[PDB]
Every structure is written in C-alpha cells, then in structure tokens.
C-alpha cells in the first residue's frame, strides 16, 4: 500500500496534489530547484529536497534521475508528475 | 542578534567558509567495538593484550575541547566529522566523547542534551567504541549520589551507547569506585579502573605517592575485576623516566592492560607517551593535532611519527587523521570567543600541579574578582595550600577545593600559621568544609587532624563512604514530579539528568520551550545570531529546511522592544524582541 | 667554526634515497676535512624524526670525532623527543628556546627538555629554576608583540609533507593572502 507520495512538479499543481494526498492520509515529498527555494509548494509538504543542483531550474525540474533518486531515498512509494514538465514523458 | 550570546563579548558575525571535508582512504577492518558487540568485554581485553602496537583513544570529542575551548564544542561540528572519524580511523580503540564537564556544560551553556549528543554520535559512529569519564560515586555531578542513582546512570549510559567507563575517584579511594565498576561489569561493558597520578615517583623528597603506593593501588584495582587499568595524569605531571618506571612496575604487578591519559601542559606529553610505550603500555589518550598541545592531549599525528620506526608503532591511519585535522582546524575558528590564552610549554605545572581545566576555570573566576592581577601569588598559594592539606590528589572536584581554599587565603591576606591561629572564627568556603567533613571521601593518610577540627567546627564529619549516608531516591516519585514539571512523561535518561542536575535540567527545559532545539544551528549563527541581509538554512528535520533571512532590524521603541524583519520560508515575519541595553518605560 | 649540515628528506625512509645516511656521513667527513670545530646538524623545518635522530647522530658520532650540535624546530610537535633521541645517541649541544617563546615553529623549550632528560643517563646542563624565573620576563615581553603573533599554533605534521621551514611558512602565507590566494593556500602547500 502507498504511504508516501512525491510530486515531480512545482507551484499550484504540487500544492493541489499535496492537499489531495493529505486528504487521503498520505505523506508528501516536494522537490524544488535552487531558484524555486521560495516557492509555496516546498513548504506545503512534509519533506522537501533540492533537485538539479547546478543546472537551469527548468532543466532541474526535468531531471529524471535526480527526481527518482530523491523519491527512492525519501521512502516515497509513488510519483505524481502533475502537468507540463514530465507528465507526458514516456522515459 | 540584539542582545548577544551571554558570557562572551558581542562581535559581528564573521564570514566563515565551509570546513574542509577529508579525502579518506577507507580500509574496512574489525574494530574493538565489533569485538565487544559480538564477543564481550573479555575478548576486547584479550584483543588489546594481543596487539603489539600501541592503541590510541581519541580525546578530541571530550577532553581536547574541555582543555582548550572550555568544553564549548557543539554537536553540529561533532556530527560534521563523526562519520569520517568512524570510517577513516577504524584503528582507534575508543573515542572519548562523554563525561566530565561535558554533561553539565552542554545543558548549562550549549542548551543541548548530552544524551541527544550521545544518541546522534552513536548513530553516526556505529563501529567506534564510546568512552565516558566516570567520576566515581559522583558520576557527572559534584555532590555525592546514592548507589541506585549510579547504577541507573550506568545502565542508561550503557544502553544508549557508552562502551568504556573510565571510573576514577577524586582521592583514589576504592570504596567510591568498586560499586560503579561492578555495575559497569554487570551491564556488559568495559570498566576502566583509574589511578590519578600525582607528585613524582622518582623524587625521594615526596614519598607519600611512591611506586609501592601505585603498585598496591593497582593490585586492589585488579582485585575488583575491572577490565582495564587506567592511569590518569591530570596535570601532565608524569615525567618520561617516571612514566617508564611506573608503567614497568604496573606491568609486572597486574595482568590488566594499561591505559595512559596525560596532558601536554609541560610540553613533555609525546616523550612521556613514548616512554610508556617502551615500557609496554597498551592504549594512550591522544587528540587531533588542531586541538592538541597546551592543556590538551598530545597529537595523534605527532605520536604516529614519534614511534614510526621504533620497536612499537602506533595503530592509526595518519593520512586519514591528517585529513580530519583539516576539518578540526577549520571548525576551531568558530570558537574564538572561548579560546584560552596564548599556548606555551608550561613547566611550572610541576610546582602547583593545577589541572588545565581547573587552571583556566580558576583564572576566569579570579579574573571576575579584582584580585586577579597576582595570579602568580594565587598559584603559589595553591601549591602551599596543597602542601598544607596533606598533599591531596588535585582533580575534579578536589582540585576545586584547593583552588577555592587558596583563593580564600590570598583574598583576605591569610597565611598557614595565621589560618591555624584564626581558624576558629574564620568562615571558610563551602568546598573546604565539605571536603574536610568527608563528603568527597577519605584521603590517603587522612585529614590533618588539627586542621580538620579548625576547618569544620560544629558540623558532623563522616569517615565512611558518603554514598552510604545519601538520602534514598525513588525513581517513580521523581519521574512523576518531573512529568508534572516538564509537562510530558520523561525517559529514564531525563529522570537521571533531573536527579543529578535538578535546576540545570529544568532551566534547559525552559530554554527548550522558549528557543527550541538550538543545537541544530551552526556555531557562528549559534554564537553571533544573524547578520543584516544574511541568508542561513536551518535543517530542523530530514527533508525540512528553514530558510531564514534577516532583512532589517528595527529601532527600539519606548518600551525597549525591537522589531526584526525576518523572511522565514519566503514570507515576511516580524519578530518582537526586547533589547536589554535599552531602558524600558521611557 | 660550526660547519652545518642541512637536513632534508628522511634517512629511515627508503623511497627517498638521495639524502640517505651515507650522504650525511660523506658530508660530515668532508666537513671534518676542513678545520671546523663542531659539526652542526640544521633541521630548519623540523623534519628529523626521533628514530631518525637517534640513527643519524649515532652514524655521525662514529664517523667523525667533532662534537655534534643539533638544531631543530617542533613544528610537528616532536622536537623534545627528537632531542631526547639524539641525547641517547650521544649528541653534545642542542638548540633550545625559553618556554614562553617555544613551541610551534620555534625551538623546543629549554625548561621542558630538562624535565624530559631528568633522571636519565644524561641530564641537561641548565639551572631550570633560574630558567623558569627568566621565562616570566619573556612571557610579559611577548605581550608587547601582539601585532606580530603568528596566530593559533598547533603541532603540524604536514611539515613532513611540504618541508616548508617556519620562516618560509609565515612569509609565503602573507604574500598569498596579499595577492589573493590565501583561501587556496592548501593547494599552494600541495604544489
Ligand atoms: C513549465 O514548464 C511548467 C509547465 C507550464 C506549461 C504547461 S504546458 C501544458 C500545461 N498547460 C498550461 O497552461 N501549462 C502547462
Ligand atoms: Mg597491547
Ligand atoms: Mn584529562
Ligand atoms: Mn632555525
């Protein structure tokens, strides 16, 4: 069973999935770039982790391996991509 | 930010670069902690006895910063390098990270639980044995405690990760040690019975502490079943020829492995360690190079090259130790307000025999009073008061008695025959009368009988163990009272800390309810607050990092309150804090 | 006249064979060929380990009959044990400083080398009670030279790594921070 979910997105949609997960009784993991350090979605989750260190922030949010590494090391069971960045990404 | 750290002078917050992480050459090896966990204490003792090399105990985490940084080293700088110490130096016998003044000082000044520090270090150092300094019948406090308190502390400390207990008495008295030794043995850990070396064994003018005294004391310490015999040189008094002779006569007397702990106060620590190594010592207490020398221990990097091509080498990875010393050098610069005086080899410690921590604490205490300009007179009075008391062992807390007594002597212009004459009406300090009443135990050769009746006039003295006369403490009612006091059910460690330090633990709880876990902050931020337009990140949890920016410090109003404009997690938050310098109600 | 051999490398390490024991033996023979009165051994960077100190002095004592003068620094924190190792090998004169101006890049202490060699085969010819009384003056005088203090000094076994003498350590670190390389002074020491 799922106990923890990571959102591989930012901004409004990340907060929306966080609210849905909290209504469903799930732990929430946020990911954020360095340039998105003051985003609301970073502080709306139980755990927040910096991703894409050194890259452009949009490229940081498109980093598949870093997001998967954060989700694996945080104990997250699922990844919600939101929309836009990697929601339709097959890889 | 507005009021400064209490006890130090308010500077600006200096810019500090990140400390250098070590580049380690890891070598997977079986440590003594693994042998203790799998096979017990006796197999550890056999492993020490079967090692031809001299083992090293790292005193960086307790004694090096107790001597040099006024034991103000915090858990953040410890945990920045604890994993690197555990992995890069598996050759260490143990790491002394607890006990002594650390337990009181962390609660009092650092506002962090020593139990929390022990838990974090144990999680970060799984393969390194943890050594504590056990002060006999008064385990970490100064007042005497009942036996059930001592065994409860030993049980909880052994459960939370302490593996080696260096048990010593302030006056080298076996009744104040053997109960703690038995409790440590019962808890499955290693008991380190300790002799406090004082005087000179090669000086015929002082035969009170000669080689036969240490021989018979080591015999009775081996009779109690303690695993390792320890020799604590508190003030760096062990001369190298004296070290060789003492270690030889202790090696041909008992079968226990010998542990030597000395200070480099006279500048002869390295040669003393080498002379003990030639005589057949097993473990020696060393520190990292950046926190070595002066009142601290000799360097482990120096003691590697001191025995590099001799008959016995030191078991350490000196490249990894030199790499870790870069981090220690970088993080020493955070504690500039707590730095002691300019270091030098001080051979005058052979005269007054002051322990280094006692030396700096008494220097600060005498600097608080306007009398502190004649510190040479204070040291001479310390030497003569020690001679007048009957040449007692001057370690914590008996060294405090000698220091307070001598400071009282030259504070009111007293003399030895003068204090003999006027001692009927003199109001001596509480430490001297409590020592002469027998609350610290029975000294070797007894008290001076005329001076005893002069010091304590009407109060009852005791010649037996003070732990026999201690008031009984029941843990259930203490736990209930503490739960009433702190608002939640306390652990065994919290109750144990409440028993020995009642007001200190409660004030720590008040500081925890007011300021939270300040141990998670970095040391420059902990000591100097926050700068204007500064950005700090505070990790309060795994995955939770507080982004704090100080935007503007407001002017104080008529009530003395200042509004600080913080940017907490991207949002503006105005914090109202009272300025102590600004007078209120104006 | 004190003919002086400057010491570098490690005589007890076979990976550095240029300055081995035979090089110092031949140099001591060449210096004794001249009319030098005392052979001097300068350890400017404190590189002489105590096991190497016993080996080098004993191999020079049976090579030449000149008295051996040893001078070293305790930058590595091993100055006292190096002098005690050479005392066992039969060194004649050692270079010591007063206790208030000892340690670090300076010489090992005169007051501490007495107690190190006390009750041994050879004592140190000094009045340590008079030396400790003199050291009170140097402790007070050193307070006048606060602007010229090096800083917080610890035993540094990295002097075995880069072999920088103590005078060169303070001087070169001053220029690196002056030009702007003080933060990379570790990489300067590496190279
Ligand atoms: C930045 O790359 C985040 C995605 C923002 C654009 C995407 S494209 C499809 C979604 N529709 C929309 O209006 N925005 C989303
Ligand atoms: Mg051994
Ligand atoms: Mn000590
Ligand atoms: Mn020189």
PDB file of C-alpha atoms in Angstrom, chain B residues 68-70 290-291 332-341 360, chain C residues 152:
ATOM      1  CA  UNK B  68      41.210  24.309  25.125  1.00  0.00           C
ATOM      2  CA  UNK B  69      37.712  25.514  24.176  1.00  0.00           C
ATOM      3  CA  UNK B  70      36.197  25.481  27.718  1.00  0.00           C
ATOM      4  CA  UNK B 290      44.470  21.037  15.696  1.00  0.00           C
ATOM      5  CA  UNK B 291      43.063  20.534  19.218  1.00  0.00           C
ATOM      6  CA  UNK B 332      38.216  25.579  15.776  1.00  0.00           C
ATOM      7  CA  UNK B 333      37.932  29.102  14.321  1.00  0.00           C
ATOM      8  CA  UNK B 334      34.224  29.195  15.239  1.00  0.00           C
ATOM      9  CA  UNK B 335      35.159  29.111  18.943  1.00  0.00           C
ATOM     10  CA  UNK B 336      37.392  32.198  19.033  1.00  0.00           C
ATOM     11  CA  UNK B 337      35.467  33.768  21.999  1.00  0.00           C
ATOM     12  CA  UNK B 338      36.110  30.609  24.052  1.00  0.00           C
ATOM     13  CA  UNK B 339      39.818  30.363  23.198  1.00  0.00           C
ATOM     14  CA  UNK B 340      42.185  30.362  26.169  1.00  0.00           C
ATOM     15  CA  UNK B 341      45.467  32.253  26.450  1.00  0.00           C
ATOM     16  CA  UNK B 360      41.641  28.147  33.260  1.00  0.00           C
TER      17      UNK B 360
ATOM     18  CA  UNK C 152      46.706  29.929  16.951  1.00  0.00           C
TER      19      UNK C 152
END
